[PDB]
A paper describes a structure:
N4-like phages have a genome size of about 75 kb, nearly twice that of T7, and encode around 70–90 ORFs, including a characteristic large virion-associated RNA polymerase ([name]) unique to this family of bacterial viruses. The massive 3,500-residue [name] 18,19, present in 4 ± 1 copies inside the mature virion 20, is ejected into the host upon infection. In stark contrast to the N4 transcriptional program, which has been studied extensively 17, many key questions about the role of phage N4 [name] as an ejection protein and its part in the DNA ejectosome remain unanswered. [name] ([name]) consists of three predicted domains: a likely membrane-spanning N-terminal domain (NTD), a single-subunit RNA polymerase ([name]) domain, and a large C-terminal domain of unknown function (CTD). In this study, we use a complementary top-down and bottom-up approach by determining the cryo-EM structures of both the full-length recombinantly expressed [name] and the fully asymmetric N4 virion tail.
Author numbering: 1007 to 2101
Write the structure that this text describes.
């Protein structure tokens, strides 16, 4: 009688075992104990809410608050009057589409005779209708409340959707990640798919309805009825031209693919629309506890209870404390930076920091696609920032004294991420306008310690390697720039502060002065320095300039410290010193190491090893003439378009440290050899497309120019030199696309493909794809990637790559078993429902039944616990388990598949989870909750912005947090979960498909052709004892390193190292001598543990 008294006019009885028509709306939802929405019980929600928005006094009375938001002024009130009238016309469209549905094929006539038309996949909206004469009609309270949710969704959906990477697009389309076309990713994130639009809209509808789900009701109605309403509202928005629908066909690019995907984009409002200063008036008027809002002053966001998009995992108490500290920081608006942005204008901002205007008649088709994506990011960030400024400006007359708070949540890899799309932590344009840092300095004397901090901040913003030089040397470098190239730019900024105007050629002045140092952070350095020059009182200068403590190769260094076992080697000691770990050198900073000891970082070290491997490969095939020519063509092509590859006049090959940046970072991230090859080739094709645009530009200026000079005009001193380069380009492309190398029996053989490149090119629409693209990747994989991966292994160590292999095998095997049991357990439950008369196919399972299936998997240890963090590698949301349609609209379109939260195969995702989660993720968690933690800082991943008044103390604390995170044992945590899984697993109950996947990870190629169940089980237990041996070695190494004196300078910006107060002196020793001393303590620790066990 609870919900049966609020909606007594609904069609059908509320009994699950009735005879006629049953109402599944009242059987699936229940009234809450305390109210959550103010529209429950009303008769005209679209009229009561519109009345409350007509005045400030009425808004306060309806909301029951002392005062309303100051931004809710008269201009905003007028704009909401038109929006409410627009929402009344949306309801008229919905009411007219229902009458057509009941008229075609006599649906209404049959439904009134007893036919269960409300249980259809498209008739699920018949559970919220009422009888009216001989026909049916909507329920006014339920219909008008859903319209209000659509209006709020239309205003803020874009600024809340997630960002799709290349991996996500590949899964949706089905095309291989390494063969994704040009601009496909940039097209996908512009709009949203059907599933994303409907699911997000349906979430708001349920919230506004203010009801609670029934745990014993089928998932086909608790999730289908809200979804069926969302699809109808989205269809109405398309008819009203509020949402534009675009259809992309995969058969155009891949004829073998028959998938069709629709994309929906919301039409955006004007940048001067007064509604942009307060777009959450409807949300705060309906919900008792609004979710979308901006926090001012003492308004502190609440702490989330579960991980991001991982509802099965809850934040640990240690993780919740870190979130609370990060949400207490106050942000402030820098007025001089804001006025500079609006004076320059959006057009000049795009011209300076973007691609500017585009003339598509002189651009390549593929080149123009990338330029538009660059412009979109800058333009969207500019619009988002100035909408916030409008809201802040209404709170007080002084915009610089309004504190701002931001919400945080935990990423599945243990990373604190700001909520929203464009915020200081994500957008660089917004980062320079809203700052949490402040300082007061005495700059009346140039020899003060305060002036040295001021110079350090300016130098780092102007692209100067401050962590590789001493303070005195850095000061000399900055002085030359200030009085040299940057002088014209400073003069313009000085006039701007006093007057407030800019010249018509301001873009050209900044472009010439900055050059290769152009960035958003470099603009603030010019303004801050110019403001200091005109300050009347330099002894109390207040500035928001900061210094960023950036880690030196944070990724690779963490891996070699956390997942390395065995005895110490001199090579490890030398290579780990480049990361900031010094043994036997008290109070040694990174600036001293680079200046005197070693000036090569990890990126340069791997480049040198790559040259060594490349020379050995050529010498192996010295007698093979066809193989030698193929290697020459690959290097020749990369020399023409990549600045990191250079060939001398004598044929000597020279490489730069910039060729191993990306490969080294993604190698630690578990990416395979094919992934590196695909990215390397993509860099070459981008340069080729850009060179085609120069051909079109040169032809327009001079139609009589030659083809060679139109291409390599600026890369050749004479015309004859230009003709030489053109011949090289044509020959290399034909050679690299005609034959490919095939690795058989351990040797490489050239095999023809028959799909070589022929004909005359067209600069406007030149494209490389199909079999031509695959031929290029085959040559790159076997001739350049293989030598590259050998050099990387030599630097990081052979033991580190051994730990990654066992970790990948252990996680993949566990995920395969979990996925098979989940699918095998929901099919047995469905077979039981077939004997239930009150059950129909399409209702799926129940939330109570789904929770029992997941609880039965607890004896296999699906989650990894480290004591302060939790990880769930196999968790995902997929529609494979349900394999059925959830709901459609009244036109039998917009079919939405049903997706549930079920485990899935891991693959190579195990390595990134533990390298990042226990690496920089744990370091930043400690830094926010440690004793005497730094205050007023912005914590970007592997970085931290610090004010000029606390650079020394905060840098020392950052190095202390790094040392704490190096005492962990990620392998031991994985071993403990894997040992429990092996105790309870039963391989004899696995499907034949599952047994084939496990054999691909535990056995060799020859051993898995006819392997039995016993062979697979025996091979899986071997991995268990491999993890135990690795984990024991890591534990001993950390114990030994804690007994000696160490200096930690991983955050090398300032030069404030941290000492571990060890009591063993290893100074005045070579790395060869230190390894022997460390190995002596390693053998003593092993003996004690074995002796203790014996006792």
């Amino acid at each position: 009688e609870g919900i049966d008294a609020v909606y007594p006019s609904l069609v059908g009885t509320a009994d699950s075992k009735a005879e006629g028509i049953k109402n599944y709306f009242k059987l699936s939802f229940t009234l809450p104990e305390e109210q959550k929405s103010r529209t429950v019980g009303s008769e005209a929600p679209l009229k009561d809410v519109a009345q409350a928005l007509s005045s400030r006094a009425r808004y306060e009375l309806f909301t029951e608050k002392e005062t309303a938001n100051p931004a809710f002024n008269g201009e905003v009130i007028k704009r909401y009057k038109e929006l409410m009238e627009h929402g009344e016309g949306i309801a008229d469209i919905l009411r007219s589409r229902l009458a057509k549905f009941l008229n075609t094929k006599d649906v209404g006539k049959r439904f009134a005779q007893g036919t269960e038309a409300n249980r259809w996949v498209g008739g699920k909206l018949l559970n919220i209708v009422e009888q009216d004469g001989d026909t049916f009609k909507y329920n006014e309270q339920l219909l008008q409340t859903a319209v209000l949710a659509g209006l709020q969704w239309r205003l803020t959906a874009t600024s809340n959707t997630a960002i799709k990477d290349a991996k996500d697009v590949a899964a949706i389309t089905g095309i291989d990640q390494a063969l994704l076309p040009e601009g496909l990713v940039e097209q996908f994130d512009t709009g949203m798919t059907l599933t994303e639009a409907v699911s997000s809209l349906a979430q708001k509808i349920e919230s506004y309805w203010g009801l609670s789900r029934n745990p014993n009701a089928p998932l086909g109605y608790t999730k289908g009825i809200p979804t069926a309403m969302a699809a109808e509202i989205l269809a109405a928005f398309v008819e009203s031209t509020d949402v534009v629908e675009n259809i992309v066909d995969m058969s155009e690019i891949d004829p073998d693919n028959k998938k069709t995907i629709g994309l929906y984009t919301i039409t955006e409002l004007d940048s001067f629309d007064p509604i942009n200063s307060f777009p959450t008036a409807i949300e705060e008027a309906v919900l008792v506890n609004p979710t979308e809002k901006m926090f001012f002053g003492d308004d502190i966001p609440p702490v989330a209870n579960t991980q991001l998009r991982n509802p099965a995992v809850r934040n640990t108490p240690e993780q919740k404390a870190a979130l609370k500290a990060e949400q207490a920081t106050e942000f402030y608006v820098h007025t001089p930076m804001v006025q500079f942005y609006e004076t320059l204008g959006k057009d000049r901002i795009l011209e300076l920091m973007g691609a500017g205007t585009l003339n598509k008649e002189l651009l390549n088709d593929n080149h123009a696609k990338s330029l538009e994506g660059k412009n979109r990011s800058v333009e969207d960030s500019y619009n988002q920032l100035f909408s916030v400024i409008e809201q802040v400006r209404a709170q007080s007359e002084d915009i610089s004294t309004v504190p701002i708070h931001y919400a945080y949540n935990m990423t599945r890899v243990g990373r604190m991420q700001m909520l929203g799309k464009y915020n200081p932590q994500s957008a660089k344009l917004v980062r320079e306008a809203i700052l949490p840092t402040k300082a007061t300095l005495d700059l009346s004397n140039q020899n003060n310690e305060d002036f040295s901090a001021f110079q350090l901040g300016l130098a780092q913003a102007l692209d100067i390697k401050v962590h590789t030089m001493t303070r005195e040397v850095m000061s000399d470098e900055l002085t030359k720039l200030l009085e040299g190239n940057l002088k014209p730019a400073i003069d313009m900024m000085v006039e701007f502060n006093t007057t407030g105007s800019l010249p018509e050629n301001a873009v050209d002045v900044l472009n010439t002065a900055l050059g290769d140092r152009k960035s958003f952070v470099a603009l603030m350095a010019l303004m801050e320095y110019s403001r200091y020059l005109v300050a009347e009182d330099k002894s109390a200068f207040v500035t928001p300039l900061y210094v960023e403590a950036d880690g030196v190769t944070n990724g690779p260094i963490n891996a070699m410290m956390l997942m390395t076992g065995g005895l110490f080697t001199p090579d490890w000691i030398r290579n780990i010193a480049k990361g900031g770990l010094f043994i036997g050198s008290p109070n040694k900073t990174m600036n001293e190491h680079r200046s005197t000891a070693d000036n090569n970082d990890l990126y340069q070290a791997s480049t040198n090893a790559l040259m060594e491997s490349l020379g050995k490969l050529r010498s192996n095939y010295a007698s093979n003439m066809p193989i030698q020519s193929q290697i020459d063509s690959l290097l020749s092509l990369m020399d023409l378009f990549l600045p990191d590859i250079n060939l001398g006049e004598n044929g000597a090959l020279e490489l730069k440290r910039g060729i191993a940046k990306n490969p080294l970072t993604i190698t630690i991230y578990g990416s395979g050899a094919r992934g590196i090859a695909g990215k390397l080739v993509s860099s070459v094709t981008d340069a080729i497309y850009e060179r085609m645009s120069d051909v079109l530009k040169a032809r327009a200026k001079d139609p009589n120019i030659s083809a060679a000079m139109a291409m390599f005009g600026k890369q050749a001193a004479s015309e004859a030199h230009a003709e030489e380069l053109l011949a090289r380009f044509l020959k290399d492309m034909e050679t690299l696309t005609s034959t490919v190398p095939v690795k058989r029996k351990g040797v490489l053989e050239l095999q023809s493909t028959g799909t070589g490149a022929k004909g005359k090119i067209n600069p406007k629409t030149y494209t490389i794809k199909g079999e031509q693209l695959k031929a290029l990747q085959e040559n790159m994989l076997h001739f350049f990637v293989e030598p590259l991966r050998n050099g990387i292994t030599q630097t990081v160590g052979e033991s580190l790559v051994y730990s990654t292999e066992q970790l990948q095998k252990a996680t993949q095997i566990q995920s395969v078993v979990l996925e098979d049991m989940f699918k095998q357990r929901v099919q047995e439950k469905l077979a039981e429902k077939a004997k239930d008369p009150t059950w129909k196919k399409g209702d799926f399972l129940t939330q109570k039944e789904l929770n029992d299936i997941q609880a039965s998997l607890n004896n296999l240890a699906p989650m990894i616990e480290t004591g302060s963090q939790t990880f769930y590698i196999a968790g995902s949301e997929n529609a494979e388990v349900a394999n059925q349609v959830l709901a459609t609209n009244l036109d039998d379109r917009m079919r939405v598949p049903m997706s549930i939260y079920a485990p899935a195969q891991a693959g190579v995702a195990g390595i990134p989870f533990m390298t990042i989660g226990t690496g920089d993720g744990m370091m930043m968690q400690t830094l926010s909750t440690m004793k005497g933690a730094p205050k007023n800082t912005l914590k970007i991943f592997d970085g931290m912005n610090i004010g000029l008044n606390d650079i020394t103390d905060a840098s020392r604390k950052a190095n202390e947090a790094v040392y704490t995170s190096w005492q962990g044992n990620p392998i031991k945590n994985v071993y403990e979960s894997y040992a429990k899984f092996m105790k309870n697993v039963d391989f004899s109950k696995l499907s034949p498909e599952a047994l084939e996947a496990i054999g691909k990870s535990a056995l060799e190629y020859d051993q898995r052709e006819n392997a039995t169940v016993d062979d697979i089980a025996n091979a899986a237990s071997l991995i268990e004892r491999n993890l135990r041996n690795i984990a024991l070695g890591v534990d001993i190494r950390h114990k030994v390193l804690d007994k000696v004196n160490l200096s930690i300078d991983q955050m090398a910006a300032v030069g404030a190292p941290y000492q571990n107060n060890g009591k063993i002196d290893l100074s005045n020793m070579t790395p060869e001598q230190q390894a022997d001393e460390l190995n002596k303590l390693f053998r003593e620790e092993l003996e004690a543990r074995k002796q203790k066990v014996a006792k």
